[PDB]
Amino acid sequence: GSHSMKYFYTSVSRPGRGEPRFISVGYVDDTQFVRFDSDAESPREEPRAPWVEQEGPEYWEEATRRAKEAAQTHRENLRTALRYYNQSEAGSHTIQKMYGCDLGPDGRLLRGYHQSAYDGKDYIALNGDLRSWTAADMAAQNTQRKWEGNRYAERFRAYLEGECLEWLRRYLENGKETLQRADPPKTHVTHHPVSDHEATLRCWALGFYPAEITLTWQRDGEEQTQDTEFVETRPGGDGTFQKWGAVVVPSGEEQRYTCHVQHEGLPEPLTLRWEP
C-alpha cells in the first residue's frame, strides 16, 4: 500500500587527511538502490538494485551532480558548525541528514521527512506541516533563522510534491517484482538445552520482507517478557531480513510456550510450538 523513499547523508571531517568523508545512500522502503562515496576510486552515483540499473547516463550524471552539491554544502556546514559550537579543526565531527517522501494509496503525499543531526544529536528537523522547523539547541536556531529567511521549506516542499513522488512512483513501477513484494518469513522453533533443568527455545523468522515484523512469546497464552531475548532485525545480505526470539524455559514446560509472529507477508498471524 504505502511506500517510502529516503536519502541518508553522512559527512565526517578528518583533520590532517584532507576533505571530509561523504557517504550517502538511497532507499525505497527497505531496499537500497543507490550509493555515493567520495572515497570511491571514481566518486559517482551507483546502482545497488537491478531495477534502477536500467536508467540512462543522464540519471547518473545528474544524480552525481546533486550528490556532490550536497557534499559541498555539508562541507561548509561543518566549518559553520565549528564556529557555532566554538570547536577546533583538529577534531573529527559528523553531519547526518535523512530526507524522504511517503507515497500513499491514493497516490498523494502522505508524509514528509527532512531531519539533520550533528555529532549524533538532533540538530534541526522539518515539522509535520512541512512548513516550520524544530531546532534542538541555540546554535541550530541560527540555521532555522536563515532557512526561514530564504524560504527553504518551500523549495524542499516543492521537491516533496514534485520529483520525489514521481520518481518514487517510477521506481515502484520499474521494480514491482521486488519492491511491491511481501515475502512471508520462514519460521521455526529450535531447542537448546542450557543444563539438565533449563533449555532455551528459539523462534526463527527468515527471509522476510519488508523488515517490519513482530515476534512474541507466550506461556499458557500469556505474553512472556521475563528471561526473553529478542535480537535486532538483521539483513540477510540478499535483500531479506532475519529475526529470532529466545525464551529460557525450565525443562518439562516446553509444550506450554508458543511463538507469535506478525508479518505483512502472512494472511494471519502465526502461532508456533516446538516440534521435536
Partner: peptide, 11 residues
C-alpha cells in the same frame, strides 16, 4: 530522486 540544490541549505 535526490534533492536538487537551487539556493542551498547552509547552516
Amino acid at each position: 530522486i535526490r534533492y536538487p540544490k537551487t539556493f542551498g541549505w547552509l547552516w
